[PDB]
Amino acid sequence: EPLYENSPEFTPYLETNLGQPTIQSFEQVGTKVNVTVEDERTLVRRNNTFLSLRDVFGKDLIYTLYYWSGKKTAKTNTNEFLIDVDKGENYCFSVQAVIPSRTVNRKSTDSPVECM
């Protein structure tokens, strides 16, 4: 028998790193602003197409929005945030993917910053 070494155990669902998210868009409706997070695709395939992060984790995945003196935060269990802003002031955004039920690697890294 060959010389070998065992690897640590690995459960994909609980341990795979969440990739850097990207803010897809954002538009105004008077005093409210809607921020949309792009549904990042994963390597998981279902009949020849790739599943999105939302398709795989469903309700286990939430997104946190950081917007801006303090930072204000909003949370959503969909890919959209609907926040109250001020008429005339320009805001900047950054999101982070989070799976709260996780023990380790619970959060992705922050997305690139986008401003109005």
């Binding site: 990739g19 850097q20 801006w68 900047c92 950054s94 890294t109 922050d110 997305s111 690139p112």
Partner: protein, 142 residues
């Protein structure tokens, strides 16, 4: 970036960082605060690791922080889709797809063989019983 007299104008992320490349300071003049500029800087300064077009064989690259991910077409694998699934037809790979015996051959495709009492079918991989009670089969279940 900076040209003669432009810095008389107020900072603009679009004009200075999107339409042009901006230094950390130009960014700090727009964002003002340190933690905010630092956060913008991480992703802006990171660079696009997908620039080398590392994903081979028609794969798609997705940039990440100091790395990338390659999404490969169905018949490929590897960090950069460098591995051809079809080129892996050797016996150590799922027995070369042979139902019973597999024989590796350098220079040509591998071949399948069967145990006495069986003969190789036309598909080159399956075996079929030539005798009434071949070994390894349970009659009352067949």
């Amino acid at each position: 970036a900076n040209a003669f007299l432009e810095e008389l104008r107020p900072g603009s992320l679009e004009r200075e960082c999107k339409e042009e490349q901006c230094s950390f300071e130009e960014a700090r003049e727009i964002f003002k605060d340190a933690e905010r500029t630092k956060l913008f800087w991480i992703s802006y300064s990171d660079g696009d690791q997908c620039a080398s077009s590392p994903c081979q064989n028609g794969g798609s690259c997705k940039d990440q922080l100091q790395s990338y991910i390659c999404f490969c077409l169905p018949a490929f694998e590897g960090r950069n889709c460098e591995t051809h699934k079809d080129d892996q037809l050797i016996c150590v790979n799922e027995n070369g797809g042979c139902e019973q015996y597999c024989s590796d051959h350098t220079g040509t495709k591998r071949s399948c063989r069967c145990h006495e009492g069986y003969s190789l079918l036309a598909d080159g991989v399956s075996c079929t019983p030539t005798v009434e009670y071949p070994c390894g089969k349970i009659p009352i279940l067949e």
